[PDB]
Amino acid sequence: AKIGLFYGTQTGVTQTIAESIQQEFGGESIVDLNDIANADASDLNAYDYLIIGCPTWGVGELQSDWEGIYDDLDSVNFQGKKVAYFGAGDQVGYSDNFQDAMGILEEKISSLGSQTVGYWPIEGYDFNESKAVRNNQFVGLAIDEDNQPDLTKNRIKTWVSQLKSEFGL
Numbered sequence: 001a002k003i004g005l006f007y008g009t010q011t012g013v014t015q016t017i018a019e020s021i022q023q024e025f026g027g028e029s030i031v032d033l034n035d036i037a038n039a040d041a042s043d044l045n046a047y048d049y050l051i052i053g054c055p056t057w058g059v060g061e062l063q064s065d066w067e068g069i070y071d072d073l074d075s076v077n078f079q080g081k082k083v084a085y086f087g088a089g090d091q092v093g094y095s096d097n098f099q100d101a102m103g104i105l106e107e108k109i110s111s112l113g114s115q116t117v118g119y120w121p122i123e124g125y126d127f128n129e130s131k132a133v134r135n136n137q138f139v140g141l142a143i144d145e146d147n148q149p150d151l152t153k154n155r156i157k158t159w160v161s162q163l164k165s166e167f168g169l
């Protein structure tokens with residue numbers, strides 16, 4: 001597929017969101033799903049369009065599989081590649097670290113010559129601080145199954161429509 005989606009998950013939510021995103025794009029012919037736990041950093045080189053999914057755990061920390069491959073990211077060819085991001089978080093229980101993991105990954109990957117695409121509005125959420133927020137907007141899709149599960153389906157629909165316009169679809 002032209003789009004490679006790499007996700008990490010601890011309690012399965014980010015994987016379910018990833019599957020939904022793949023479905024919304026049109027399925028396997030359009031988006032390849034890859035669990036970062038079973039990947040080598042070089043696997044990301046096979047795609048020119050990437051989607052990076054990761055939930056936040058601990059206190060604003062990267063999900064363990066992403067944490068484990070983080071130091072290898074600088075060896076990947078991200079030069080001129082368009083990269084989108086999504087994450088699962090809990091804005092009520094972790095208002096000061098909402099979606100910090102997505103922010104950490106974008107901050108690292110965007111510093112490696114890539115182009116972040118898929119910015120998302122912060123207005124549909126209530127939180128205090130987030131490393132995923134730059135210039136008053138999220139660096140990618142923020143999903144909250146703990147507090148806003150009813151909004152997930154339409155958020156994904158909206159975001160994917162937005163991304164197609166930015167991914168050549």
Ligand SMILES: Cc1cc2nc3c(=O)[nH]c(=O)nc-3n(C[C@H](O)[C@H](O)[C@H](O)COP(=O)(O)O)c2cc1C
Nearest residue numbers: 010011012013014055056057060089090094098099
């Ligand atoms: C112990 C614990 C720590 C968490 N830490 C954070 C955090 O710092 N920020 C946040 O946005 N959500 C945090 N969450 C919420 C998770 O990101 C959320 O439940 C998400 O759906 C988990 O996704 P996953 O199932 O893909 O692992 C935490 C939840 C728990 C139970």
